[PDB]
Design a protein around this ligand. Structure first.
Ligand SMILES: N[C@@H](CCC(O)O)C(=O)O
Lengths: 535, 216
């Protein structure tokens, strides 16, 4: 997800501007829907989650605008438990205490019911391994451990009039960890880490840790007022894009794993270069396709030198010459993506990591993809020339083999056509004759998971985009009807509606449509109007 | 004929006054109510008019009932949310909320259930599945919200490093994490950079040893 806020001293309007785009899998219908909801207490427009009241994360109320990216706070620990008692007891300190065991059942369409055990220790439920074998993994997560009052925030946030009032209204939010970026008509901008994080050692971030030793227990909660925040920074720019929120020498442990800083650095670069940032400038940032890896790739392929196989040498030459842009019109971007998928597969196979998921402790739905994880580590290993996992191969041997394999996988399609998402409705595989009706239409789009236009993929499956911006938005704080937004298919969840897939056209162009706030304009422009009346 | 009516007038039991819902050229609903309870009743009704299958499928995924619609592909995910105790923690949370949030949730599901009682044709997916919608309770919205964000982030990286231990060894497994470009750009302070801490194999040695034994 990306977002950013630009202070009044650096905007064309002399008021704050906020903009961004959340990135999630393209499940259908889209997770976020556009709504405007007004009553005597508030008048709010933004994104809702169908099935949930209010505007948890993306909205303005005519005084404060706010939006989020996932903060990558570490809110989930895994504990390795020692069991005895045929799985009925678990060690804590030097005592084995009773574990809770119960039975439950699910029904499965077209198959037999499945009965199963639910086993719970002082840490949380067993999610992997068989306690009867003496060891299993339990999960202690902020999402489940203790009473959560995030829903009390949904009635408090609509009343906020300033960035600071909005952050006080978010006290107690713990369901999901967010970078909550806000701006207000008084001219302030801010970033709050809106999360509940337990106080415990940094070691818990690396691996499942011993549940019995007492050394890895949660010691209370990091207080609200200790969470990282900034309001009105002196450079007039805030950017978040799932990158490391604070340095690791911060006194509370908050994060081990987060995205690479590519997207934050590219947004920051574009904003530092524009100290008269206009509402119209947000779309060009949303659309940015420069890959951070072009320099590393070019250097390593040049040093590798000419290949014997003619098709591999053609591919090498095109990659050394590539401008690094994942533009929809680029055929060479597709060849880069095929090359990197082939390299990731070869490294995952040679290392033995493809088979790491054969272990019983891997069995946590939906499972880890070895290539999908190795994909993000390859740039570090290649930049450092660390060939420790290649069982005797050098990176040069891996790159050369990847040129050969990839040369047989070149379709020649522009990246927009190669990467075009196949939006799949949840019932399309059960009702295949209906897939043409159920699946919303898609257009060619560029980007990859490293670019600000973060249309990512599943590397073990192929190049098609599987996740990306579910919505894009820009808030013009204090000139609200100039704000804009879009979603990746449309307002309707009904496959037959004119509004099921109509916003895919602007979204695929990295354009937005008006986010209308004024009631007289809304009334004048309404296409349907309905009265909901007392019964 | 297979879409719900978006014009005219429809009743909602429990509304205090009328609510007007105007859709713009993109179908986006702009909802104008008098009081706050009516606003949340209207929002539950309007979410159901456009997204009822999404709402019920996301609630089934939270409550471990999605394999009833999706088949075996969803069985292991249903078993995992039953083991996490979704219903228990969402009823826990609801009971502890303030009056204003309980009343928000009650009004919102009254809106959903009025839509289910409104006589609209069911969405195409209920025809395909031979299904009928089941009614909503106030704590259901807490399960839907919890499902949206279920288990994202750190737990997968930890699980992955553990799985890598018996394959590539501790020193290599503890380099399995997303790249930092050589040096992170931090969010706070804005523009600041820093080198991340690498794993301390010495302090992790008891955890590594216990996991290798447990896994072997
Ligand atoms: N979808 C996100 C924004 C963060 C992005 O997904 O990283 C969020 O709403 O959590």
């Amino acid at each position: 997800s990306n977002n950013w806020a630009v202070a009044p001293g650096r905007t064309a309007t002399g008021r704050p501007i906020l903009a961004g785009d959340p990135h999630r899998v393209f499940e259908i219908p889209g997770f976020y829907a556009q709504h405007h909801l007004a009553c005597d207490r508030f008048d709010m427009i933004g994104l809702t989650v169908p099935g949930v009241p209010g505007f948890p994360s993306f909205a303005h109320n005519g005084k404060v605008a706010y939006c989020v990216t996932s903060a990558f706070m570490d809110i989930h620990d895994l504990y390795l438990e020692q069991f005895a008692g045929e799985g009925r007891t678990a060690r804590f300190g030097n005592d084995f205490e009773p574990v809770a065991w119960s039975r439950d059942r699910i029904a499965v369409r077209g198959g037999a019911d499945r009965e199963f055990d639910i086993v719970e220790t002082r840490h949380g439920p067993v999610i992997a391994g068989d306690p009867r074998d003496g060891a299993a993994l339990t999960l202690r997560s902020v999402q489940f451990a203790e009473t959560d009052l995030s829903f009390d925030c949904l009635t408090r946030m609509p009343g906020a009039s300033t960035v600071a009032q909005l952050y006080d209204a978010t006290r107690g939010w713990g369901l999901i960890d967010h970078n909550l970026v806000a701006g207000d008509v008084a001219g302030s901008i801010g970033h709050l880490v809106r999360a509940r994080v337990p106080s415990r050692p940094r070691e818990n971030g690396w691996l499942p840790v011993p549940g019995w030793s007492g050394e890895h227990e949660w010691r209370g909660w990091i207080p609200h007022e200790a969470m990282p925040r900034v309001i009105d920074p002196p450079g007039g720019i805030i950017v978040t894009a799932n990158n490391r929120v604070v340095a690791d020498d911060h006194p509370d442990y908050l994060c081990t794993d987060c995205h690479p800083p590519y997207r934050a650095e590219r947004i920051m670069k574009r904003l530092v270069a524009n100290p008269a940032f206009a509402v119209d400038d947000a779309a060009a940032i949303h659309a940015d396709t420069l890959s951070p890896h072009v320099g590393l790739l070019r250097r390593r392929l040049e040093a590798l030198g000419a290949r014997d196989d003619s098709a591999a040498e053609g591919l090498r030459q095109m990659l050394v010459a590539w401008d690094g842009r994942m533009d929809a019109a680029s055929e060479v971007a597709s060849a880069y993506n095929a090359f990197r998928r082939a390299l990731t597969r070869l490294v995952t196979d040679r290392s033995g990591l493809e088979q790491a998921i054969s272990h019983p402790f891997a069995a946590v739905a939906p499972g880890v993809s070895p290539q999908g994880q190795v994909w993000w580590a390859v740039p570090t290993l290649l930049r450092d020339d660390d060939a420790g996992m290649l069982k005797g191969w050098s990176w040069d041997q891996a790159l050369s083999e990847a040129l050969s394999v990839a040369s047989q996988n070149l379709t020649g399609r522009s990246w927009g056509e190669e990467h075009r998402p196949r939006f799949t409705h949840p019932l399309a595989t059960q009702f295949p004759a209906w897939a043409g009706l159920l699946n919303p239409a898609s257009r060619p789009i560029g980007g990859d998971g490293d670019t600000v236009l973060a249309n990512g993929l599943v590397p073990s499956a192929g190049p098609q985009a599987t996740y990306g911006a579910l919505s894009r938005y820009v808030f013009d704080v204090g000139n609200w009807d100039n704000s804009r937004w879009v979603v990746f298919h449309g307002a309707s969840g009904h496959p037959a509606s004119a509004h099921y897939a109509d916003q895919n056209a602007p979204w695929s162009d990295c354009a937005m449509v008006p986010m209308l706030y004024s009631w007289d304009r809304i009334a004048a422009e309404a296409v349907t109007s309905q009265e909901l009346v007392p019964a | 004929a297979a879409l719900p009516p978006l014009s005219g007038s429809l009743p909602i039991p429990g509304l205090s006054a009328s609510v007007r819902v105007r859709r713009d050229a993109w179908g986006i609903p702009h909802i104008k109510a008098s009081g706050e309870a009516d606003a949340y009743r209207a929002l539950g009704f309007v979410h159901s008019q456009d997204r009822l299958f999404q709402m019920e499928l996301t609630r089934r995924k939270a409550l471990g009932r999605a394999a009833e619609w999706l088949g075996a592909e969803a069985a292991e995910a249903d078993i995992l949310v039953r083991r996490l105790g979704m219903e228990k923690v969402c009823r826990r949370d609801f009971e502890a909320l303030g009056v204003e949030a309980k009343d928000m949730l009650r009004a919102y599901v009254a809106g959903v259930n009025a839509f289910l009682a409104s006589g609209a044709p069911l969405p195409v997916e209920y025809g395909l599945l031979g299904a009928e919608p089941e009614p909503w309770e106030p704590w259901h919205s807490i399960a839907v919200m919890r499902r949206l964000g279920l288990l994202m982030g750190s737990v997968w990286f930890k699980l992955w490093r553990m799985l890598a231990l018996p394959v590539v060894g501790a020193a290599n497994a503890l380099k399995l994490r997303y790249d930092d470009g050589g040096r992170d750009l931090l969010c706070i302070p804005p523009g600041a950079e820093a080198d991340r801490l690498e794993a301390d194999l010495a302090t992790l040695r008891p955890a590594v040893d216990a996991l290798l034994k447990a896994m072997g």
